[PDB]
């Protein structure tokens, strides 16, 4: 179903494929995440410990805070693909 | 799904990799950081041990300080990549 | 996930080890030193022994004293090799 | 839809690139822009530090200054490209 | 979308890459330059070493200052070749 | 972006290098300058080795001195090359 | 029931094993805590004794404070295990 390599049925099964990885690794990202909110302890607000550990955990924050508009521009990439392969059709069916 | 390189499902599967990476990295680094603070001792301000051993603690406090901006570099790159993967599928979509 | 040699997950790795070996050597350097501090004593001030003496802890100060720039450039290298992954991205991934 | 190489079709495909072209730019600029704001402190204003980094974000902020004129002709020669084709149907198309 | 080799699209990757690059260089040199105010002393005004050290800081404040004309200059070259295109399309568009 | 050699990101490049370069050798030679005037001491106001050293330091300060306006030149070299650039744009690109 | 290597009976047995394995050590490891609690005394807080066995324990102590940890990222283990079997069967069952 398609003219060149634009297959409805491949497009479906894509989408499936990406939303089930993309659900599997929000799982496995929040499951990690809690046993790492676990292990980590608070020493004390300005003993050496804190110093030693507090940049880490705002890289932390910082990386996970990035990883949302990533998601948004991986979910943007879809429609252009989908537009892409309507103006492929429209340009030689006619 | 894609047109020569980029994979929405390989760059789901790369964020993947590079969360869990980060991850990890923090939870080693703060766990064993916690058993160097417990290590070394506080031996007297003036003491010959202090002359000794002072330097080596200002140079960790002062790496770990660099970590961060290192860590927010790292998580613009994936932006980047991202970007460049969608101009690339519409330069030659179309 | 990268164009030619750029690997995120490869950094990532790399600044892994690269905290790791340092938190080790601040470790044994803080260790060691604090048994050399046990080690010498102090015999006098102006006799045969302080004269034989001082010198070599003088050169152990100033050589602890350069580490921590040496620390400080180590840590900037980082910053500098993202960045050419980064421009090196830029310049052929469009 | 055309003469020799107006295409009103490849004209709406190359005003969609361009845009998202731009998009993506401010996009990225504003994100590294906040990291750079992050990333540098304040020392003090008459020490050492001061005088050697000043100059440095003088010249950023000129340079961003000098930005809006830049996309303001890049706007302009739009215009100018869809009025030399309108011209050029005209001239023989008659 | 051009006519010989000006592309607005190829503009405007241009400045974005000019723009990360000058950010990352504003970056680099504000970061190391902390490590040299830090790294340098003030002796003393009139011992050996303020004669031996005084002419070097100048200088290196001199340069610093030079840089925010250089930044200017390359900011107002990009207008030009902007200018040189579009009355390059004017000429044999019509 | 440019027309035969002139490459802005070339030329940011090429700022940041020098820059570095030159931020890089204040800093050795200071911290070098402090070493040689911990070294040198001073034996007497005339006797054998104050008619012996004297010259060699009255050199020294002399080259130190001579230092600043080699960078001021070296500074203002890349004025010129910018300017050069310009000059050659507008020459043929209308 | 499977593809290539992924078989769910499989995976049950294995999961089977593992649990009556980590059941046994449980078991073991309480069983023989038991007998070095009996076994060690507290001779006084300050005399030989105190000093020669007190390190001994707190080993013991933060070894086994460790082992939780350990059990936690064994567990998470076997998620991606089952996840990599899904996204497997799904890439060529299509």
Same mark, same amino acid.
């Given at each position: 179903?398609g003219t060149n390599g634009f297959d409805i049925?491949t497009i479906?099964?894509a &989408?499936?494929? /990406?939303? @089930?990885?993309?659900? &599997? %690794?929000? &799982?496995? &990202? %929040?499951? !990690?995440? $809690?046993?790492? +909110?676990?292990?980590?302890?608070? =020493?004390? =607000?300005?003993?050496? +410990? #804190?110093?030693? $550990?507090? =940049?880490?955990?705002?890289?932390? @924050?910082?990386? !996970? %805070? !990035?990883? =949302? $508009?990533? #998601? @948004?521009?991986?979910? /943007? $990439?879809g429609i252009v693909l989908i537009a892409a392969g309507i103006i492929s059709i429209i340009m030689?069916?006619?």
């Amino acid at each position: 179903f398609g003219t060149n390599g634009f297959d409805i049925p491949t497009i479906a099964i894509a &989408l499936l494929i /990406v939303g @089930v990885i993309i659900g &599997l %690794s929000g &799982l496995i &990202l %929040s499951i !990690f995440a $809690t046993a790492t +909110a676990s292990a980590i302890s608070n =020493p004390s =607000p300005g003993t050496l +410990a #804190y110093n030693l $550990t507090h =940049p880490l955990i705002n890289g932390m @924050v910082s990386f !996970f %805070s !990035f990883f =949302p $508009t990533l #998601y @948004v521009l991986l979910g /943007v $990439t879809g429609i252009v693909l989908i537009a892409a392969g309507i103006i492929s059709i429209i340009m030689e069916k006619f």
